């Protein structure tokens, strides 16, 4: 298939590697790939993480310097600040290179052209599908985990080899898998979730609360229990991740199965339309524009919506309640 | 408020109590309330659970006999079979009673008139909001848990007292809480979830998969990882149950927050309409009719939909994958 | 291709075979497969057909007994009564079996779950496409005829072999063909005809009559002649079955060809919509529910519609006329 | 009620106060509150107003210095330039403070998060409802005037006291009143006027002119007289402010009253829809984004619309006319 389960580690042996950022991701990948016998350094600004990383036994330099000494670099920082960092500190040093490899964990800034490296550079991606805390939770067991691979620019005919070597170095395989894809697909996927079923779910819950309270005389303290204040949803999610999404429902009552299936097949087109609209809005590059402009304006809509959500009735009731149950 | 946190246990002391059914619920409530010093018996047909219950130290009789000996009874069996049991075995013995108390965990069959006990009987409800496994997980810690209370028929002016005494007996308070409500509200709530946001969520996920695969050239093995094959959703659910639904999003990236909030406020009316329609369909008693008739016909729609869901492309891909990851 | 033209008869030799029902189908298949050298018995209730079958040289037992003695059984009875018969008389005997084969001529009751045999049984289908009278009309000539094959449950890895052996035993091949399909496809097809073009045709004819009479001053005795009282339609149908549907029109006038083709391509979408709606209504299992419930209610709609059709003006005129022409 | 008519002046006595800006507002408030016995300084850049303020007897420093010396500050400058000034000159000095008070006359930049002061600061608002010229026109008479109060951040439990002390210091009470509200309400109100009835009025007038001229053969010189070139509207406005909006109409003819009332109740929903749309557009923070982005782009739409309005036919005719009447 398109799938990979283990591969070689030939190309990274003898080369120096630089990890930009020491947050959750960078810390994890760096620690692991050091355990796998690789000369590793760190590039970060002098702050909390700087002291932490030098404490854990890493030689720490400044970013631009870390790139000078390195033949391979991992740009593990938020997608909201990477642009300026790349423009000021990296791109110069990079114009003054010969054969370099640049790896990302997200394809947002590259899929949309906000970062356009030269042609003397191999541009790749290695994107996990885990929070990062669980990833150590799994490496201690010798387990692997899944990732996505992508190549944007091959100037060596060796990019895929580097990508698989990296996947092995951070301990995703063997034990997990590695799928080959594009920068575009990764961005599309990471965003379609955040735009389609998460907000839909939240809005449906909120609407159920509002309706029950204002049209059937229900007490808030009960609506909250039924809808989300119980750990009902987490159990469903676990059974989904373990047994399967549909086989999960065998553990429930026939009444529930019937209602769920009927109403699912009844409302499938409505949401399909929405998903089409949003995926198209993304594929074109409109959302990136929207978001960048909001940053340039000062995050007013963000602010107002954060306010409106927290000053809603449901949230106040939830506050009173969580206080009563002792939940912090 | 409408809320209760602890109460007396005066009325159940000296009286005999019968637990109909020894599934998850009955087993739990029976064991606990026996620990709290109450003369308890069991009424069940001779099967697996019969041997189990007599093994665990319970004197087991037959249902009708268990009702003759009892002054209080808990009808803890599925809502799909309770009707016949009540008609044949219970109602007769019950016509031959003087002062009786009948408790339910679900208000479906009573809210809709499928079970109409006499007026010489106090009819009440005590409905938890926990799977049942977690309930023992909490009693061992001396903790409580939430429940709903309701009264349909008071022939003694003491029903609420009995209900609170019961809530205490099974170990929901103190430690948890007890809300007072109707049979109608409990049914409405239990059903609105199964009809509004669960199926909507599932359909949205399925639509995202289909779209990504058939319009943007994505590989199935990646769509599944992004959407639900990762334990992403369970972590969200936990943070919701613990920190709150909206405060949960602070742990994510600003991009995600922005997209989520915007698209949530953008699609709130659409789902509100759906929720209105379904809640109205329930309040009237139409769904109960639908479901009863399907039972009488032989579950053809149920069958066909179970087939169509499992024979879908997403499910086959999920099967191949879970096999690859080792997940049973 | 997916097609079969002749096959072996290995598995049925040495085994006993029971034919449930002695109507048109059962009589035919039984007689033939006896001619092909197979030990055959009959299972039926004591009525007309019982005496007929014992007369024609068949040893006749009672149904349950016929199943005890048999290793293979053909359930050739109407789809409207098979359920009770299966529940009472067959299923018990069948729980007390080891290796059994159960064959149907229709997939209605199984495709929709109204009959769910165990897993120790091989469940198959062999469905002809002939009225039954014509089938003897063809066997006397050594000819075959078409059938459909399907397998729902294989517990022996030999089901298809049994199905082909059966197809040969009843004399459908060689001489005809045998197509492999599902229970679902057979039901879908048998029903889509009865729901799409038969009623459409009838309604169009009726509308033409009504229009001609009430808006253009035509006499009934003439409308009936043009539309269906002539043997015009039967000749068209024959030429269709023989020469082909479109090549059939070469024998008509150019005017007719032109009008037919134009108006056919002009009204294709309208009927396509209808066919979609009805096929979807079937695939889901809704029509089975509808029909079962009507049976349980007492056939009121059936009754009223039979009345309205026969008490229409067209029918009365047809009666007067057929009386005049001497047609009984 | 929510209303205030006079209050104490305890907290401002002994403290130094800095007035940022010496335009109309700053000049007025500063002069007055100096008359009321308060140590007052000014912070402004060296321009016309600088010389004016030092002339009128005020010790003038530079902005950042004025904040260092002050325990209370009034940020009386346009909402279009305050952001940069706050970011560069104020925020630093303010990080280096202990207990400070910051007052605004407009809630735009704060309601929408374009200015987010720290938590060691009390953030308040005191917003008048007068042009500023009339305010001196009223103080010379010992009169007061209305204002709105708001508090965004209380770090001292004394904010409201400071706000009322300020309201008194500038001479709004006693003599006028002081209403308590939010930053959000003030912005919402200031904007809803500028978006709902002002532009509607103007467009209606323009449409009346266009219609009369191009469909009924009227001369421009007459349409202008009827619609706005007469001082008709000002008298109506005065009678509104004095006698009331509806009681104002008693001074007109019954014909006018009838037409006005009928057509008012006839077109109330249409404009209600518009007002809803615009108020919602504001509450969310969309207009702030729109306006900020237009500034960043270079005011092209602003430019083009200013041109189109002044190059319209009505404006040219008005020019010819005002020239004829001698009106400059
Ligand atoms: Mg994601
Ligand atoms: Mg993300
Ligand atoms: Mg529930
Ligand atoms: Mg339920
Ligand atoms: Mg047919
Ligand atoms: Mg048929
Ligand atoms: Mg204004
Ligand atoms: Mg203004």
mmCIF file of C-alpha atoms in Angstrom, chain D residues 4 13 19 26-27 33 62 94 124 149 178 181 185 196 204 259 283-284 299 305 322:
data_model
loop_
_atom_site.group_PDB
_atom_site.id
_atom_site.type_symbol
_atom_site.label_atom_id
_atom_site.label_comp_id
_atom_site.label_asym_id
_atom_site.label_seq_id
_atom_site.Cartn_x
_atom_site.Cartn_y
_atom_site.Cartn_z
ATOM 1 C CA UNK D 4 -26.664 59.789 40.214
ATOM 2 C CA UNK D 13 -7.796 65.855 46.614
ATOM 3 C CA UNK D 19 -4.804 65.659 30.808
ATOM 4 C CA UNK D 26 -9.328 68.302 27.117
ATOM 5 C CA UNK D 27 -9.287 72.091 27.174
ATOM 6 C CA UNK D 33 -11.611 71.004 37.068
ATOM 7 C CA UNK D 62 5.759 65.758 27.427
ATOM 8 C CA UNK D 94 2.678 52.252 33.087
ATOM 9 C CA UNK D 124 -12.921 53.632 33.800
ATOM 10 C CA UNK D 149 -20.014 55.965 33.562
ATOM 11 C CA UNK D 178 -24.630 60.627 35.586
ATOM 12 C CA UNK D 181 -23.140 51.719 32.064
ATOM 13 C CA UNK D 185 -23.010 50.134 25.625
ATOM 14 C CA UNK D 196 -28.984 53.677 11.219
ATOM 15 C CA UNK D 204 -34.312 59.454 1.814
ATOM 16 C CA UNK D 259 -49.694 61.309 7.246
ATOM 17 C CA UNK D 283 -21.699 43.681 18.848
ATOM 18 C CA UNK D 284 -19.543 41.011 17.187
ATOM 19 C CA UNK D 299 -8.693 54.914 2.587
ATOM 20 C CA UNK D 305 -17.381 57.929 -1.813
ATOM 21 C CA UNK D 322 -26.276 78.773 -1.578
#
